[PDB]
Amino acid sequence: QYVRIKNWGSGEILHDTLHHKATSDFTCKSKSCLGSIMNPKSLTRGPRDKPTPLEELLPHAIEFINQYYGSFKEAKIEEHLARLEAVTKEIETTGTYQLTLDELIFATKMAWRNAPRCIGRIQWSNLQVFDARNCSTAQEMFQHICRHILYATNNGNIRSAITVFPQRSDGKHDFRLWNSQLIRYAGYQMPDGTIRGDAATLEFTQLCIDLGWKPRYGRFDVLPLVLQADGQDPEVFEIPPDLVLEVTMEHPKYEWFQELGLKWYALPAVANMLLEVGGLEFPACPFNGWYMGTEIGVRDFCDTQRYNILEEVGRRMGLETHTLASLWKDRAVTEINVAVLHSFQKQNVTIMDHHTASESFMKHMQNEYRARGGCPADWIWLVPPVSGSITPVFHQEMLNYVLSPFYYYQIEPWKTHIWQ
């Protein structure tokens, strides 16, 4: 009927009626490249009630196994056949099937390798996999998560890793982390009308409060891990402060910068994503990489929907804040960016600047193209929020497409969960 278009800044929504009057075929699509959309139904893998139908599951499984065994330099045909046989049988026996460890590993790397929105993909071969498939309780999830957060952090020398929880069974016994990302500050709507902390985590914070969380009312309060096992409702577990490594922000020239009382966690771990592989899907499998400066300096600190520090950092620099054309914003942000990179380097916490990051991705694309003849890339995401064309990936044409295995988005669990 119409398309819902949201402006992530004002949160305002618009209804596009015009697209119906489109000509014929546009680029690969007919009447609209909705590539600009954040959460398209196409990048999401929702709920269930019934298991994955055998006729579908079987081929998908066979496909994935052909991918796996076709991988190794010198194919183990017998084992390839043997595995195909063993899987077909196991599928027609249980209704689902289990992956060998080396399969999940290969899976997870390929899924990452197939994530069109990730720029750190040149690191695809170096990934740690925590097999939590045999897990069964919320408490057990928590213990696994802590181990991950521990291993990942490694005292600043951040390590990429993913902890895969139990796969999907029927569709009502799902393990799901309700948080956006492993570590994430809270946002509270204060009495005097203002907002404190991360305004993005406002709705989620209230949820934590509703599940009886102790609101510490601050600017950098690490939110609690909201876990749900095998269908069972979400149990709230607080992350051990000793596990949350942070970096306090300080500029190499502007000493008044640390007076801002800014800091940010060192661990970027995406929590709420689903892993599809060979017909199987793991709705709980948090992964982490390492920060890329611009994420914190530009997005986290300078967005209106986030901490929104730009006005202040601009003022303390003595810039013409009431004159857009003075490019004070361009000046401030860059300094905030240097602050972050500096503060991370100083406190020996792994981080990469967007330029070095883009240059390594371009190299990756070449390796990827020469290797498998392609590389799914979402330009909109791959190009940094600042210094776009000063970066190589801006002048690079890309093809955005969904392969498999793949890391899909999911429906926020609190909207579709049946309470008990």
Ligand X SMILES: C[C@H](O)[C@H](O)[C@H]1CNc2nc(N)[nH]c(=O)c2N1
Binding-site residue numbers for Zn(2+) are: 28, 33
Who contacts 183 (Cβ-Cβ below 8 Å, separation ≥6)?
Answer: 149, 222, 239, 244, 265, 267, 269
Q: Which of 90, 295, 311, 359 is catalytic?
A: 295
350 in helix, strand or coil?
coil
121 given a catalytic annotation: yes
Tokens for 359, please give them. Answer: 């240059």
Binding mask 5-24 for ligand X (x = CB under 6 A): ---x----------------
118 given a catalytic annotation: yes
Q: Of 60 and 316, which CB lies nearer to its own copies in the complex structure? A: 60
Residues binding ligand HEM (CB under 6 A): 112, 115, 117-120, 123, 127, 160, 162, 270, 287, 289-290, 292, 295, 352, 407
Which does residue 287 bind out of ligand HEM, its own copies, ligand X, none, counting CB within 5 to 8 angstroms by kind? ligand HEM
38 binds ligand X (CB under 6 A): yes
**Angstrom distances, CA of residue 40 to CA of 136, 207, 317, 408:** 32, 25, 40, 10
242 binds ligand X (CB under 6 A): no
Scan for tokens 């857009």, then name that residue.
324
Q: Of 59 and 388, which CB lies nearer to ligand HEM in the complex structure? A: 388
Q: Which residues are annotated as a binding site for L-arginine?
A: 181, 290-291, 295
147 given a catalytic annotation: no
| Binding residue for its own copies, selected from 76, 216, 346, 395, defined by CB under 8 A | 395
d(CA 280, CA 57): 8
Q: Which of 45, 113, 118, 335 is catalytic?
A: 118
Sheet holding 269-270, edge to edge: 128-131, 161-164, 287-288, 269-270
Question: Is the previous residue joined to 215 through a cis bond, with omega within 30 degrees of 0?
Answer: no
The DSSP string of 181-224 is BSS-B-EEE-TTS-EEE-GGGHHHHHHHHHTT-----SSS-BPP
208 given a catalytic annotation: no
d(CA 228, CA 235): 6
| Binding residue for ligand X, selected from 1, 10, 24, 36, defined by CB under 6 A | 36
Residues 183-222 that bind ligand X (CB under 6 A): none
Select from 76-84, 234-242, 281-289, 378-386 the region that touches its own copies (CB under 8 A). 378-386
CB of 276 closer than 8 Å to CB of 259: no
d(CA 105, CA 359): 27
374 binds its own copies (CB under 8 A): yes
Residues 349-408 that bind ligand X (CB under 6 A): 380-381, 394-397
Chain residues binding ligand X by CB under 6 A are 8, 36, 38, 380-381, 394-397
Q: Which residues are catalytic?
A: 118, 121, 290, 295
